[PDB]
Amino acid sequence: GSDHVDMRTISFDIPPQEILTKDSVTISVDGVVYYRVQNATLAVANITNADSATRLLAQTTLRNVLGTKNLSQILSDREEIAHNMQSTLDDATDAWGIKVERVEIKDVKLPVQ
Numbered sequence: 001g002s003d004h005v006d007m008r009t010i011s012f013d014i015p016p017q018e019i020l021t022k023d024s025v026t027i028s029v030d031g032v033v034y035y036r037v038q039n040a041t042l043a044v045a046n047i048t049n050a051d052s053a054t055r056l057l058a059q060t061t062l063r064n065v066l067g068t069k070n071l072s073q074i075l076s077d078r079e080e081i082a083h084n085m086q087s088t089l090d091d092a093t094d095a096w097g098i099k100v101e102r103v104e105i106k107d108v109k110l111p112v113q
Contacts, residue, residue: 007040010098012054016107019063022070025112029066029074031082031105033058033089039097050096057092061085062105075108 012035016028037043043050065084066074074081082103090100 008036010035010037012051012058014055014058014062014105016109017059017063018109019067021067021074023111025071027066027071027074027111028107028109029062029081029105030107031062031078031103033086033100033103035089035093035098035100037098043097054089054093057089058085061088071108071110075110078105081105 012033014031014033016030018026018028020026062081062085065081069077069080082105085105086100086103093100
């Protein structure tokens with residue numbers, strides 16, 4: 001019956017977003033996110049707004065998780081930001097017929113060079 005087009009592999013890239021840490025220092029962190037959408041139809045049909053939400057929600061979640069820590073913590077502990085970021089996104093996207101797979105980040109800019 002159905003077995004055409006790969007609508008299970010959905011990966012998104014997040015550009016270096018600047019956020020404030022516990023040290024009140026701005027840091028630009030970048031990473032990639034991998035997820036699988038089950039509601040490709042409704043998903044792709046409303047992706048025009050879904051994409052923005054994913055980027056906005058991802059930026060806010062990552063900004064908070066990392067913003068609540070030090071530069072040496074968010075840069076050394078990407079798992080915390082990745083888990084927290086996927087924690088909300090997974091539940092926030094789950095209801096939208098989307099299941100997260102794995103989020104990997106790596107590209108944080110240090111304040112004082």
